[PDB]
Symmetry: D2
Subunit: 249 residues, 4 copies
């Protein structure tokens, strides 16, 4: 059963090589992520949340991702170097998985987002004029540095920083929130991920998970896609949510 190990640097990759060898698993090494990753049964990412997002950008069909975290913190990950040898043995032996939806922009045709599709100002410190509508209905219009269309997974990223609610990973929703809105009152809008979001702005940019961005004027459509992100049932995912969150930055 084949497995890929992706890594930022040489950190701990030797012990993971020998961790998978003990468990009867073919292993191949990957400095950078490629579209070849979907020829393997699973993937063991080594670096952090950031590393996982760069992997998913080279994946439509997503083989299960285990996630060793090098740094200090990580919400998408499964283990650390201190204790990964144990948690990997469990991960592969059960082979239980979970799947979180990935949305897609209309102007960035095949690149999918797990966290969000942000819509920012092309020039920094300049303000764009954003009009939002979902399922046809005019939801809002507002001047802001940007606008975020995040899934619940990404409710803990940019969205969090704009004032967003912490939404547990299992409840499946969009969070719609502006960045530095220039208006007296405003409120985050949480809606079902079955709807069709639309943003309309001139002189703007669109960014999937802080990774692929394109320029666009006019309008874009963001909806749920057919290809989710597959991880490895992290039984404690929920209980760990309120604590990883308590200690961001």
């Amino acid at each position: 059963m084949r497995a890929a190990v992706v890594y930022k640097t040489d950190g701990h990759v030797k012990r993971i090589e020998e961790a998978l060898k003990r468990l009867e698993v073919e292993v191949e090494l990957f400095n950078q992520p490629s579209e070849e990753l979907e020829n393997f049964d699973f993937i063991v990412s080594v670096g952090g949340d950031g590393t996982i997002l760069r992997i998913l950008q080279k994946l439509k069909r997503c083989p299960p991702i285990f996630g060793i975290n090098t740094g200090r913190v990580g919400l998408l990950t499964h283990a650390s170097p201190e204790n990964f040898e144990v948690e990997l043995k469990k991960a592969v032996e059960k082979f239980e998985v979970e799947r979180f939806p990935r949305v897609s922009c209309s102007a960035m045709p095949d690149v999918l987002a797990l966290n969000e599709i942000a819509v920012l100002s092309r020039k920094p410190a300049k303000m764009i004029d954003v009009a939002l509508r979902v399922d046809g209905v005019e939801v809002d219009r507002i001047r802001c540095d940007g606008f975020i269309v995040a899934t619940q997974i990404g409710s803990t990223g940019y969205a969090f920083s704009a004032g967003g609610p912490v939404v547990e990973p299992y409840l499946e929703c969009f969070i719609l929130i502006p960045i530095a809105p220039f208006r007296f009152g405003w409120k985050p809008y949480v809606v079902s991920m079955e709807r069709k979001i639309e943003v309309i702005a001139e002189k703007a940019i669109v960014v999937a998970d802080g990774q692929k961005s394109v320029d666009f004027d006019g309008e874009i459509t963001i909806e749920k896609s057919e290809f989710p992100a597959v991880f490895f049932k992290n039984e404690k995912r929920f209980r760990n949510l309120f604590g990883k969150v308590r200690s961001i930055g």
Copy 2:
């Protein structure tokens, strides 16, 4: 096919009788809400959001509610006096109904909120030491004027005022947000409604939908209930959500 027509003041009630009579519907006027309301094919509420919440307490089994708003803004209502006669007709001829869940606190067994359960301090200008726990797990421990456990429907009520997000009516979930938290960082949590909430504080009261209130010491659980609120299908519920929210005062 008979009907109950509940009212606070003598609003447009001469007219609502006369529209109900013309649609060949028997009418029983109700000076105030009653348990007796269970025995009607539907209830026309005539007043505002508050009129409907009161109605709901005195129901377990809930006939369809056509709420009419004589005030400025009502998120639960289908029409105003200008349009009520056309909508009431559409509503009763098709008879399509929809239902949003009601929640249940330990302290008051046979009572049900549609908006929220709020745990506040018995005495005012005073903080309680609230501890929250969703599904066995510890999620928070904060000091505050109170804590709010609210459905998406009540996202636009009390919790809205405490800094909470506006969640659309068709996304079943809980919204757990404190009133006046004494702490550097805090966040509103939005979790699934299929979960077991538990609130722990001393010298406090619990309040279901701003109606029934009861002193409590120690522990309560809040959970989803088996007898929900029933209104007639509102084709434009989602559409108006965003306009009405901006006129809240």
Copy 3:
């Protein structure tokens, strides 16, 4: 020269009684604060920030206060118990002070607040309709759980939890912020302390420093009194502000 040492618990009192001994200063023990504290060259409180606020309710003319934070955290205190020996000697030999304004009320005539005056609902879970003017101009009319007229000192207290800004101690100003405002957009106003505040509300109370409360209806005015809180000089008051504020819980 003479001093009154005010305490709640009789823990660290024999250590402090002997520190003041070897400083040519006469001592008098005070199990609870009193109007008699005015007859001393200074005061040494022994407890939290509350031990201080409780002291100032019995002072009009205020001799300098040296605060010893017992357990706890506090931004009105001058020293912990395991360094106070030194800090007292430095504070009484230098004998250097600084003063912060206290405000007054209409409804409670002889009473003075260092932190804030909070207007709240009389019955909890009920919101009142507050209507605020400063120097005669209407500023606002909001439905809320309460309203806080704070000073820069008490901007780290009740107004901090209502969503206020951290204002430094040396900038004299009012902070005007509501508690659970049922309104789409709202904002705290920071204004000059030389202005005459005026809150209007029915079915309410007023509370100076969470210490004294009286029912009221109609209007009250808050003004800057001529009798300031007086403390020894804390040079590190400003540099400690930011690290204490982070640890608020």
Copy 4:
């Protein structure tokens, strides 16, 4: 005595030429702002707050400015097309004058900001890593899209959007708020304007009243300048502050 009318479009400029003609004031017209505007007894900006910022950028020593808002809402302006005639005459013969301070920054040294000095990310959709200090003190260290060092006049500007308090125009003070901070727990700080602000970023840019901006890599210093902004006295500046803020959009 002669004056300079500065406009952006040809809105009500003929009618303004004629008002100054009836007041025996020789007028020169300005397609846009020049250093040249220094040699006049007063100035009549015609457009908005933004037009006034542009004028001020070309001015060290500032002659009285009389703003006519042709737009929707102007914190900095005196009159509308309806009542400019009345008010222009009133204030020219009274010749009273207010002085709100402007602020210099240590990277574009001879430029001046009434509103703020914003330190932004150089590329967009990337967050920088701002370290804040004031009078040599570590007040914060935070990952964010940017950081506003605002004055009270610019507290209804960019800082307002970032989550900041409304500050009366006559309470002199800095305001230290971030844009999109990635941290569970932040708060805007309001400190004295006599203090020395200092920001340490990397991969950043500094902006001043949204006009002049230059790349910077290291550490800058914001501090109260020698030459302020000068407007004719608005007797209704304070009064109109609150209704104008409520219609910021």
